[PDB]
A paper describes a structure:
The [name] methylosome consists of [name] (protein arginine methyltransferase 5), [name], and [name]. Both biochemical and structural studies indicate that [name] and [name] exist as a stable complex of four heterodimers, which recruits four [name] molecules through direct interaction with [name]. [name] (previously termed [name]), the catalytic component of the complex, belongs to type II protein methyltransferases and generates monomethyl arginines (MMA) as intermediates and symmetric dimethyl arginines (sDMA) as final products. In addition to the spliceosomal snRNPs, animal cells (but not plants or lower eukaryotes) contain the U7 [name] in which Sm protein D1 and D2 are replaced by the Sm-like proteins [name] and [name], respectively.
To determine how [name] interacts with [name], we mixed all three methylosome components with the [name]/11 heterodimer and purified their complex by gel filtration chromatography for cryo-EM studies, which yielded a structure of the complex at 2.86 Å resolution. Clear EM density was observed for [name] and [name], and for only a few residues of the [name] binding motif (PBM) in [name]. The remaining parts of [name], most of [name] and the entire [name] were disordered, providing no structural information about the interaction between the [name]/[name] heterodimer and [name]. [name] and [name] form a heterooctamer of four tightly bound heterodimers, consistent with previous structural studies of the methylosome by X-ray crystallography and cryo-EM. We observed EM density consistent with a peptide segment in the active site of [name]. After examining many possibilities, residues 71-GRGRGR-76 in the amino-terminal extension of [name] were chosen as the most likely interpretation of this density. The side chain of Arg74 is inserted deep into the active site and would be located next to the cofactor SAM, arguing that it is poised for methylation. The six-residue peptide of [name] bound to the active site of [name] assumes the conformation of a type II reverse turn, with the Arg residue ready for methylation located at the third position of the turn between two glycines in the primary sequence. Therefore, the current structure suggests that a GRG motif may be preferred for the methylation site, and a GRA motif could also be accommodated. For the cofactor SAM (or SAH), EM density for only adenosine is observed in the four active sites of [name], and the rest of the cofactor (the Met residue) is disordered.
Residue numbers in the entry:
A (entry chain D), F (entry chain L): 71 to 76
B (entry chain K): 5 to 8
C (entry chain B): 23 to 207, 213 to 242, 249 to 328
D (entry chain A): 14 to 171, 180 to 291, 296 to 527, 531 to 637
E (entry chain I): 14 to 173, 180 to 291, 297 to 526, 531 to 637
């Protein structure tokens, strides 16, 4: 999970 | 060491 | 001389001596190589024991011609145009050049009328004119839009030749012209110049129809016409080969005279005998060299 | 560079594979049957041709077949021939060769797209894909320039650049955008324009085919490439395609290792990219910090961005300087309220800013996450002391003991308001003084229309059971889109300013002038935010804050792609909808053709208040 | 051996992991909150207790929390208390601890099953599992012997389902939580072990860890910790399942250190077909269908990497050739052998070298319908076999033979001996057999045994797919290497086929005397085959051919598990049903309780003719 | 796949 995502 |  | 020749005999050529040249390639099994075989006793073909000469090539043998009497110009599947030369005793076949200058399978080779220049059509869409003396390409031409099926050198004018391709074009080429090609307005599959009439050629298409063109038609076969060969007579007969495993000999009006179904696989190359002008040797992919007597 | 050798003549297969590996190629594209060994399937006697039809399986090991060999279809196989016998033989032979490649377990298989009508080829491929179990990939060999446009002008008596893309588009549309059908692109001597290369770059290009004929010759004789060709190779190396070298060695003085060595040379001469690597075109789901409690690892991913928190610290620095003059420095205490304090990087930014501004602050760290409150309260016990007051409450329902001079929050998402920053800061502005400041001061979202066929296949692959079978097209996806094409410049959608002193429901109509023929696949959403006066954070692809990887773009898909041509304008409507319980987005394309309204009533995606 | 240390006292966590890792343990079971720090959630003033509720997450790295720590629920948390205030406080606190473990990203979390009623515990765990996204596993710490049966008999007026008590605790818990994949067993091994049948029911359970107190360790003559013979036997059986071992308690051999308790297990591990089946244990597969689906080259490679089966066919052909040509007729009698479904050619080579070692003359036919395996067969014939072997590319059912056969040899046997249509294929391959002809194999029988496995049941449920009946996965046989399962009764024969047969629909009723309490999850199918008189191949687990790994057992699941008691027989009925196009199986349990008929009309699984 | 299974 990276960039404000799960 | 490992003997019953 | 290999111990055995391959099943798919691809070409057969009669030189003016009357000796036969077989080009074969294995199109199946472990090794896809080819081989050349000179049979000066033509009735003994294709038995590898009774051969005058033989050689193994590095790849397949898609097509071949005679460059004169002791030259064998081969189209290889490796993009190679190669020149094999018989020795003085006609016992060995020896390579002079092997130029890899086509980018895919060289599908056809024809020798121009001078005998010192050749043409080569390939599956790379490029048609090359070669100078056989210096072993170079004189001129490459990307004028088709699809792979070249046949190139046919004129027997009369050295520069003039013909080509057909999968883009449904029959170009007529004059090498000395500034724009050398001009279109002679189903896909054509084979070409043949008329041996005497300088402006006349026959061509066979992928539906089995042989047509005659002035620079006539006939549903000779059921599948594509693989090859079209003319007899050495004063009034030539036309031998038509096809993928329906059939041979048909036609007269000057494309009316059928002879039909042979001796082949159990595709019929690849026919050649008329220079000695017995009624004899017609056809080879096939069933390892069968059939000699016919044409009425 | 992973690269391959495309040979159409393999006399012995083990020797040829050995020589190819000696030259340095990773795979080898080769015909599984003999290219000239035309086969009959209908007519006797040639239907009954004896013997083996091709080579043995046993000539290479299993792992050799599955990792080293890319198969090729024979050139005589024309399933779209106008002659019925030819096309039936070609259907049967294409089936035979595809089944032999499936049997050999080849990783890939090259098929040619060299004419406009390829419908029967598409049907036979689609029937192979749906028959049996097999996992080979199908690389459709299509040129950049059609071969009838590359031919020389030497014939005496005898859509230009967008031809072969429409060949590929028709093929992949007939085959229903399969995951197993990709592109092998042929790069010829003549190279098309920049926008043709952009649609192509948006495609599933798994390999690139470089003939040796397109290579130029230098003063030392080695093969090189033109500057436009080098640019194209760099753009393709961004995609990590494999380069296939075809044709014969035109630089016969040198080896065939030289064409490969030039590509290795270009490869060795090509923070956000290192972070985003391994996440390209990988669809996450956007975080919902208000409705879901995050994890330690999520917060840790947040706090590995020094640029964003340096920006917040600079904004607080400038605001503290503005609100307190130098003469009132030691007697004026500024109440800062960090709303959604997290594990505490905003609180540390505020403390460091008040040190740097050299002003006195009384700070509140509000956080509704009961598990991050543990971290905040251990921070408070050890480091912060009595300066920071940790509140374990929602900023909306928390009753403050005083008003705030500044409220600072990091509640922004990839679309700037999909994490309910307006609704959280709306309920958190009653404990702000009448001259109070909110950091971020305002934030805008920006949308651009995009084409990406891989992203469309990823969204299709997100079809989950026990829900609407097309509800994956009505969710935004946090995605590091890589293999895409942006059709038009981003335009602002929604703007929220805080404090709001005057409805968070919004409606926007955006008209995007497209100058190129394309196929719209979705909308990519970015944001900008003004924290304080000249201090901004942006994820827009032009004004992007450098090295700031907190936010990936957001993606709103559309259910069916919309074909667009040049001069048209894509008109799209975006709504921000809400009720007492939920907030969602709805979208619909209205020009050039209408789409359905996506996510009505939040049926596929809501953000929980 | 991967082992952990269960500590219930961690003064400082970093020092404690250091001391635990020096001793050799791989993880650490520890309390995430203080085990004595009881917390109030409903009632003032202790509800509003200030400060952090526990220690921070920043004391270890994220990778340390996600790999090294197994969390424990605090001992005072009794969600099934009879006092409602205690019950509600324990629900709230267990939710708090579970959510904090999810926040920390712990891989596992220990919860105690130390009493009969654990329904509120099961509900709070079920609601945690379905709330949010988290991937921690839940190890129910259940004793092998209940704690009120391990008590001393030292109470003057209270002298001391006895051995099957705690298993019913676990069964009730996992049934309430609906057989979750994320709930497994951590088993406590006391000084008193139960019987061998009780230990077998546990060995069919999802045991992920085994608690070994230091008090169950005996003492040798040199003073080291050792284990009794029954304890060593249990450790060996649990070492088969690859569970982890948790050492609990204090050092009861104070001269030495916990390295001694760990070194005994690390010693006892090294004093422990199975290599082929590594990684395939409890991994469901689809049974092969060679008649309908064309096998890959690699499938044939796995077939042919078994030398025992092909040696057995070669010996059977040897013996049949001896008993068909007397040595006076040795040099003039040619035996027509027909290898049916010749494959890539191992049965043909077996026939050739069998006739070679029998000194008899054979004329051999290799019939194969796979055109791609026919390619290999024809290359074999061209290069090796020559005129001795005639390769036929046909289906043995509609092949027209030029002559009749003395022997037909086939390997059309599946894991249930007839699920690959060997009867139907050898029915049509029988008219070209002589009136005194032999078939190899001439006999084959299938065997069924009832099994229990929670893991196999969860794998079958995990095989649910969309665009399908939601319980179709329970009406399919699975080729599975049965590892974590319990077999309830000895196998009994189901169906028998003999060739030549001079109707393949079958119906069998099998009663299994189940001498133990269990829960039925499916049936395991094996087979025996008589190739020739004494030459047999068997995967049946009591007469298994040694080293012969060509076949894994079949599993026929049932849709709902069937609880079985002592002395209760299990009646199952199988059907082999067929029509002109399809062949399938149907099964139903009819005692102790009926189940539905599984796979009616072949709606979920047919073998295609 | 092993054991006559895919
Ligand atoms: N209403 C709220 N009150 C307090 N913290 C919040 C609120 N909404 C979100 N947060 C926190 O804000 C941070 C980023 O969204 C996270 O720590 C999240 O828990
Ligand atoms: N009816 C059949 N005729 C010929 N070969 C068969 C037939 N059924 C199965 N086989 C072959 O038997 C082998 C294993 O069953 C495979 O090689 C498969 O192709």
């Amino acid at each position: 999970g990276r960039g404000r995502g799960r | 060491q490992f003997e019953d | 001389a290999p111990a055995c020749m391959e099943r798919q005999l691809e070409a057969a050529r009669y030189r003016s001596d009357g000796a036969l040249l077989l080009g074969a390639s294995s199109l199946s099994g472990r090794c896809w190589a080819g081989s050349l075989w000179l049979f000066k006793d033509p009735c003994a073909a294709p038995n590898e024991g009774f051969c005058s000469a033989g050689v193994q090539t590095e790849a397949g043998v898609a097509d071949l011609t005679w460059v004169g009497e002791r030259g064998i110009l081969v189209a290889s599947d490796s993009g190679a145009v190669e020149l094999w030369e018989l020795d003085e005793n006609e016992t060995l076949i020896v390579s002079k050049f092997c130029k890899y200058e086509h980018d895919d399978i060289v599908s056809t080779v024809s020798v121009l009328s001078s005998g010192t220049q050749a043409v080569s059509g390939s599956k790379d869409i490029c048609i090359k004119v070669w100078d056989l003396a210096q072993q170079v390409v004189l001129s490459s031409y990307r004028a088709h839009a699809a792979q070249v099926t046949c190139v046919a050198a004129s027997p009369h004018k050295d520069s003039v030749f013909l080509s057909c391709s999968e883009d449904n074009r029959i170009l007529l080429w004059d090498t000395r012209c500034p724009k050398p090609a001009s279109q002679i307005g189903y896909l054509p599959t084979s070409l043949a110049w008329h041996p005497q009439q300088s402006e006349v050629f026959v061509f066979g298409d992928e539906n089995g129809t042989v047509s005659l063109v002035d620079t006539l038609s006939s549903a000779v076969h059921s599948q594509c016409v693989t090859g079209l060969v003319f007899s050495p007579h004063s009034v030539p007969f036309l031998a038509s080969l096809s993928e329906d495993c059939s041979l048909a000999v036609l007269d000057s009006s494309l009316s059928e005279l002879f039909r042979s179904q001796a082949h159990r696989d595709f019929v690849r190359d026919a050649t008329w005998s220079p000695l017995n002008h009624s004899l017609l040797t056809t080879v096939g992919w069933d390892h069968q060299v059939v000699h016919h007597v044409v009425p | 560079v992973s690269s391959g050798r495309d040979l159409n003549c393999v006399p012995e297969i083990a020797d040829t594979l050995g020589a190819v590996a000696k030259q340095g190629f990773d795979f080898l594209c080769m015909p599984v049957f003999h290219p000239r060994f035309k086969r009959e399937f209908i007519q006797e006697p040639a239907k009954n041709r004896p013997g083996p039809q091709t080579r043995s399986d046993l000539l290479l090991s299993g792992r050799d077949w599955n990792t080293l060999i890319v198969g090729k279809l024979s050139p005589w196989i024309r399933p779209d021939s106008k002659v019925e016998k030819i096309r039936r033989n070609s259907e049967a032979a294409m089936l035979q060769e595809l089944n032999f490649g499936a049997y050999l377990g080849l990783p890939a298989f090259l098929l040619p797209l060299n004419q406009e009508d390829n419908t029967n080829l598409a049907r036979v491929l689609t029937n192979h894909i749906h028959t049996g179990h097999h996992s080979s990939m199908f690389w459709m060999r299509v040129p950049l320039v059609a071969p009838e446009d590359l031919r020389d002008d030497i014939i005496e008596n005898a859509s230009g650049e967008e031809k072969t893309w429409m060949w590929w588009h028709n093929f992949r549309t007939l085959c229903d955008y399969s995951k197993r059908i990709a592109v092998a692109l042929e790069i010829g001597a003549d190279l098309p324009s920049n926008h043709v290369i952009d649609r192509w770059l948006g495609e599933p290009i798994k390999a690139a085919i470089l003939p040796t004929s397109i290579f130029l010759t230098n003063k030392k004789g080695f093969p090189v490439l033109s500057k436009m060709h080098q640019r194209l190779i760099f753009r393709l190396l961004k995609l990590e395609v494999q380069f296939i070298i075809t044709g014969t060695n035109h630089h016969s003085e040198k080896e065939f290792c030289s064409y490969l060595q030039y590509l290795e040379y270009l490869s060795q001469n090509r923070a956000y990219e290192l972070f985003a690597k391994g996440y390209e075109d990988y669809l996450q789901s956007p975080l919902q910090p208000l409705m879901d409690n995050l994890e330690s690892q999520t917060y840790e991913v947040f706090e590995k961005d020094p640029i964003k928190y340096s920006q917040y610290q600079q904004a607080i620095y400038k605001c503290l300087l503005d609100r307190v003059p130098e003469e009132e420095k030691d007697t004026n205490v500024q109440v800062l309220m960090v709303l959604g304090a997290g594990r505490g990087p905003l609180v540390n930014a505020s403390l460091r800013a008040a040190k740097q501004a050299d002003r006195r602050i009384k700070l509140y760290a509000v956080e509704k996450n009961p598990n991050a409150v543990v971290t905040l309260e251990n921070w408070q016990f050890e480091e912060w002391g009595s300066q920071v007051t940790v509140v374990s409450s929602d900023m909306r329902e928390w009753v403050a003991p005083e008003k705030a001079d500044i409220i600072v929050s990091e509640l922004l998402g990839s679309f700037a308001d999909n994490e309910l920053s307006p609704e959280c800061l709306d309920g958190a502005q009653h404990f702000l003084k009448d001259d109070g400041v909110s950091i971020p001061g305002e934030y805008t979202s920006f949308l651009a229309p995009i084409s990406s066929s891989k992203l469309y296949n990823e969204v299709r692959a997100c079809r989950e059971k026990d829900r609407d079978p097309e509800a994956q097209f009505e969710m935004p996806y946090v995605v590091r889109l890589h293999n895409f094409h942006q059709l038009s410049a981003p335009q602002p959608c929604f703007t929220f300013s805080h404090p709001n002193r005057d409805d968070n429901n919004r409606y926007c109509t955006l008209e995007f002038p497209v100058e190129v023929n394309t196929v719209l696949h979705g909308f990519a959403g970015y944001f900008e935010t003004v924290l304080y006066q000249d201090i901004t954070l942006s994820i827009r692809p032009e004004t992007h804050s450098p090295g700031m990887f907190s936010w990936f773009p957001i993606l709103f898909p559309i259910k069916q792609p919309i074909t667009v041509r040049e001069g048209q304008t894509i008109c799209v409507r975006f709504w921000r909808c809400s009720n007492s319980k939920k907030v969602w987005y709805e979208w619909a394309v209205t020009a050039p053709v209408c789409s359905a309204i996506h996510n009505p009533t939040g049926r596929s995606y809501t953000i929980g208040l």
